[PDB]
Symmetry: C2
Subunit: 180 residues, 2 copies
């Protein structure tokens, strides 16, 4: 099984084109994955990816190429990487405010939602706590009493059974002695 | 490695003597293991077992025996099993009321404890439920709103980024075309 030379073009697409939308996707994941985003069970990345990949659009455009192309690509790779890398940074810059504004906005949204929710939730949790604190004290002496009685009941049983186990052991011993 | 002939005596001790206290232990486990017994974390069987086993007390009593003993024991085994089995049932009978009364008493105890506890616990669980029912309705429309906005924000970002990914793909395509 040989390896397609087009893998080199695929790598250039991933590294220098799709990185832009992937970073976009990562900013969205941070929203989806936040403590509050999970609270809401946000699923937001359906249809995020376009159907046709950047790689397909490149191969489709370049059309078929010769071995001269691949030898020329291998010749220019480092100089093309350098120049592609500066185009990528010039675009990353242009796009960064959108990503910044998105990150700040969903956090604003979540905070504004936390304010409407966390207080009412805190309250109920507080009162539930204070009513439970008021109940682990009433059943507290009730517990150490049941345990004392339970222990007394078991010691009584253990004691009641003892003479009967002795009687059995003595009947066995006497039957065994008869085999001497 | 040979096997001790005394294993036969050990088996008789287990089967026809220790079964009595073991059943006792099983009645206690039922208490310990009940839904309410677990609630209280009952640990009740410490020191239940005597230090010296019935087997040790039998061997200690019989003292050393001959091969004639083991041949005689093998001769009488079925007739000794039958007769030991009827002694065991005559004792099981004598002891059963104790086990019955113990089982009935710890259940009485647990019920009497359930009455003091379950109501107060039910109440708090009811009100906590009714206050939460009163809160999953207020944040309900708030949730479907945040989701709509979240979806709108992500579609905006996806859209803002598109022309920049196209520009990158076009700069790569043009650099690749130059290698033809």
């Amino acid at each position: 099984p040989p390896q397609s030379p087009w893998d080199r073009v695929k790598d250039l697409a991933t590294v220098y084109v799709d990185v832009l939308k992937d970073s976009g996707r990562d900013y969205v994941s941070q929203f989806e994955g936040s403590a509050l985003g999970k609270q809401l069970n946000l699923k937001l990345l359906d249809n995020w990816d376009s159907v046709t990949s950047t790689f397909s659009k490149l191969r489709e455009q370049l059309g078929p190429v010769t071995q001269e192309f691949w030898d020329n690509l291998e010749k220019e790779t480092e100089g093309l990487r350098q120049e592609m890398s500066k185009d990528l940074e010039e675009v990353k810059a242009k796009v960064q405010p959108y990503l910044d504004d998105f990150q700040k906005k969903w956090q604003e949204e979540m905070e504004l939602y936390r304010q409407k929710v966390e207080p009412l939730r805190a309250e109920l949790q507080e009162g539930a706590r204070q009513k439970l604190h008021e109940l682990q004290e009433k059943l507290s002496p009730l517990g150490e009493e049941m345990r004392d009685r339970a222990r007394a009941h078991v010691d009584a049983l253990r004691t009641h059974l003892a003479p009967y186990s002795d009687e059995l052991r003595q009947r066995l011993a006497a039957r065994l002695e008869a085999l001497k």
